[PDB]
Design a protein around this ligand. Structure first.
Ligand SMILES: Cc1cc2nc3c(=O)[nH]c(=O)nc-3n(C[C@H](O)[C@H](O)[C@H](O)COP(=O)(O)O)c2cc1C
Ligand SMILES: Cc1cc2nc3c(=O)[nH]c(=O)nc-3n(C[C@H](O)[C@H](O)[C@H](O)COP(=O)(O)O)c2cc1C
Ligand SMILES: Cc1cc2nc3c(=O)[nH]c(=O)nc-3n(C[C@H](O)[C@H](O)[C@H](O)COP(=O)(O)O)c2cc1C
Lengths: 184, 184, 184, 184, 184, 184, 184, 184
């Protein structure tokens, strides 16, 4: 029984280090697991109940259904101002309003990449808190906070080059897989 | 010593209860305090370093300047998914990248309104964490979590009518003024 | 498959509302679930590595083993100063140092009873954060924050009397059972 | 303008790295600032309202009075299980019940030391949350999380020798002094 | 005519302030100047003529070659015991024995970061003395001694944040480029 | 009082002229002075605070204790690139980090041998500067700079034969003894 | 037992900060120590061996004798062009040619004052090197480099007013006293 | 394109070996290079800011102008007390205060003569440190330390006779020429 994971990306910039990490996941994916990226969160309008009343934005409904059929979600995001990027939270806000809400019962792993050293622990904390409210099953272990990322992805070639980082992400995907199969 | 406060609104919908509360603040304001609304957070694009490199969106600079010259800020916002609305966080994210950063040293009070009963305590917690990182001085007391907001503003007429709520908010404004004058 | 749950109590006072709730759990327990109380957290000394080196206090080892053999744990606790009571956190600190650590992989539900309206949301938040680190599986839903408890447990008789509350707790226990069996 | 700060220590063990940091603060203190240690939190019994009715434990009243008369408090603590040590929280719980409550309006700085890399960020977050409730004024910047403390204090001799750490802490103490003088 | 500078780092610890400064140089570099880090000095064995007779260690030849193709070298190092760190001096010792010797005629700028007020000036003195022997052309002005570095790079995030320091360094790089072009 | 001197050797090579000088010292030594070599500096790893975090290398602690218990130290070293060899400096860097630091108050004599004519005068200068920081008492006179050392030790037999040098070294050892007894 | 210290001043201008420091020494002097100024270095002619043949200049023989009979010398001097002022070096040059040479075996403490931040570290270094040649015993610790001296002396009123500076110089004088007596 | 060099003499005595070396330079000078002596440093008064305020001494202004107009400077000096003669340093001190300062950007070569074996290496070191501060471009190679000078200049006739030394000095002037033209 092959697993299907989808990735949600929390940064919009082209040279995003988190995007590099996200793009690496399908090549890193251990046997039995296929991984594909979701559409951009940049296509969502700002959440507004008035907009919702008129109808859900198409990219929102598309993403929700993509999450619904997936075996798990991997969220890869930077940390802004000791919390989750507003753009990413905005995507979560829209998704949370869909019926049925696609994150309920969904296995989720969190990954954060940062040039520094804390590696996004606070964004992950806040993100987990929302995901508990949405009844998601967020992987406890191993925690994926990737520090000093600037020297772990190669400039010009966009790709995550750190071999140690790649192996770590593979172990996290395996644990996420185990969680998904346990909950099924 | 006359103070000028500005208000930041965390909801975009026309019938927003938090908008109703924000509009009451300038009439409610104790003497010696004038209060004006900031522009809408809905005019901001999603944060992206690429957009920033090209130049700060005009509404971002306008808001940063109004905050810089104000003596204090009142943030009035709902709670989405046990945290701050993505849209509001996105505005904070944009403001945080301005030089000089307008919230540094700024006295701030938080107000949350909810139809529910917790009344937005969780959004205020996460907001406070971000504001500390941005070196703002956020009012400790009194805390303003307005629950059961449905019966405190009259529908059709948009306005906050509950006299006890008004009197409480005036008193929070007093504490904010006192905090501002202490730090000056 | 009959399940056995144990209860961990976060308040030391005799007239504790949280104690009333904890005592109600074994009679409330649905068919197939038996519930027994752990020893008091008041018998633990303050955590100290110096004390630990000399040897683990007996009640710590006794509690750890009762948790290890249990199918799930229910923590019933008040909220002090927007967080977990120090005494309860102290018990968790001791448990976390036992090998093997008894909360790893353990299903846990959180319950808070309070005179207020927030009903211990902040304590449960902080507690969840610690339990995540300890690799516990904490029930997402339903959340058990019992507000206005003064009229829900009767004075003179010490016991939880509100029938609606009892029925709620039964359903939470049912959800905890389902989580435990899913993870088994 | 001579200031007096008191230090509250969150670890009980003899060889505590945080104790080593706390002992260094008075010699590190910039001109105009004297710093003295509070009594041990290990002398407090577990918080219980039943005990409180009988009377506040003497060491609790002694510490509350030293805090009340101090110009500021520096809390130095490790992080246990992604939060504040139970014993330390227990001390805060006791202090919070004294009248008048000694931390209200008190300038406070936080210091955490850890063998890891995070250096106690999570403990400081939870501590800040409690301190808001108690109306303390906790220093926003600079934040003192001392990671890899093992190579910063020399074993066998108990003392903080790392010159970079000392300079950082002195600058934090300068900022606390400024906060204290501003609020006075 | 685009220039390529390489950086030589004199400290081995991960949380090194000098490394933080070294990492900032390529983003700081004015247009027409690209800056890349050399390999670690930690891979060199201790210098020994006996080892040399057997053959030059690979990382030595690799570094010498990278220096050779570079238009200039920036040496970024702390000061140990009023002088140059032995590990760095050891790398210079190895390089000085390569034929042809890569630093002869090479433009060199020196940068030192330190907690003190001296800012690593003594290390720069001794370093200059060795470089004269190696016939390097070391920039006279501006001299870059970054004192009180603890308040100039952010703890937790590894990054050089002091804006005045960054511009000062950009100015040194301009002066280094000018020196290089004069000799070219 | 049979004084005990220890010798620290700055060259790692088998045929070292400085090693030849160091080995000559105990036979040159007047009655009442025993001279023994310290362990090799080649056994030290490169200094790193990260390595220190995990623990001081055993040979570092051994050398520190032997220096600490010795009545005086004789440092015998070549000069590399107008300064002290990196390997030797690396050993000093490690010793300086030991508590208590073994060179404090320690009588020290410097001996340098070189094929050239300067005879290691520049190395002694830099070494003295470090030794000032480490609070050592280094012998002013007589200064032992052995130039043209190739013709002062006989090939094939490794031994220091130049009668003028031996007599000179003997007088230096006497002065070192006199200094040691004076400081007692 | 009574000590007599003499001060040698390295600056000739009336509003000299070092002159201010020099005048403070006899009142700052701890008990058992009297401090008197030497004559001015400005009365010495430029050194010349031809002039020396005719006879040593009178102020030189006078200074040499005052130093010889003194228990220790305190040299207070600015730093010129990263080194010792030529005038002061000239006075040293003259003293060095006297028989017997007055600085041999003499305890010396160095003090430098500067409006800047380095505070004369480079001058003290060069001075030390010369004094080694002259067999002086120069105090290793504490080092007295007084930076930002402009606010440490009150202008127009001539005298050193910074209390922290006075106490520090007092401590150096104590160490100089201890050094002299050990060597006795 | 003919170059003009000026010579600065560091000894005042009639029979100075360094003077003999200085006088030989114009005859040794290769075609395309003419060399003239500066005025004597003995005509300078001791540096004093009080004197400077009244006006720069005539010889200072004269020497500054000749250095400013020269293509390079050759400094010929003995070494006193392991450093530069005070009188020479005094001339430099005076020059350093003129605007514009004449040594800035000036190519400089150093020549030292001594009867010993070190050959003035220490004076050249210290001289270089000051000249770097004054932004001079000091020749790295070849280095001219004329040791064993007594038999290299003949008494009775005042002249520098050592043919190898003369050739060495000729090569240095060419290197000095090449340096000057590179910087032009
Ligand atoms: C508005 C904003 C807020 C940020 N806040 C933090 C923060 O709190 N902690 C941190 O380590 N980095 C913070 N960063 C830096 C990001 O971690 C860094 O820019 C990262 O590379 C962004 O992720 P990306 O490369 O995938 O776009 C912030 C950046 C921005 C633009
Ligand atoms: C990298 C290196 C740098 C050196 N630098 C100098 C120097 O600056 N001055 C000098 O007189 N000799 C210098 N030497 C020569 C050494 O003094 C010579 O190799 C001596 O024999 C080394 O001491 P040893 O025989 O005990 O190994 C240098 C040698 C090496 C390998
Ligand atoms: C020729 C000259 C060179 C100087 N060089 C330096 C220097 O290298 N570094 C420094 O910090 N100050 C330098 N100074 C400034 C002195 O510190 C200044 O004279 C100071 O006021 C101390 O001298 P005073 O005792 O006369 O006050 C120099 C001043 C002069 C006149």
């Amino acid at each position: 029984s092959p697993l299907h994971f989808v990735t949600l990306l929390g940064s919009l910039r082209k040279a995003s280090f988190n995007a590099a990490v996200a793009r690496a996941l399908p090549e890193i994916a251990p046997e039995g697991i296929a991984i594909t990226p979701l559409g951009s969160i940049g296509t969502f309008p700002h959440y507004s109940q008035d907009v919702q009343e008129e109808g859900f934005p198409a990219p929102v409904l598309t993403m929700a259904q993509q999450i619904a059929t997936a075996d798990a979600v991997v969220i890869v995001t930077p940390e802004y101002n000791y919390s989750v990027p507003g753009v990413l939270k905005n995507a979560i806000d829209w998704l949370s309003r869909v019926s049925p809400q696609p994150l309920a019962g969904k296995p989720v792993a969190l990954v954060t990449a940062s040039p520094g050293m804390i590696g996004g622990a606070r964004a992950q904390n806040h993100l987990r808190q929302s995901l508990v409210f949405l009844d998601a099953y967020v992987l406890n272990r191993p925690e994926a906070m990737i520090g000093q990322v600037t020297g772990k992805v190669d400039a010009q070639t966009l790709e995550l080059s750190d071999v140690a980082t790649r192996e770590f992400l593979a172990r996290q995907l395996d644990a996420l897989a185990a969680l998904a199969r346990t909950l099924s």
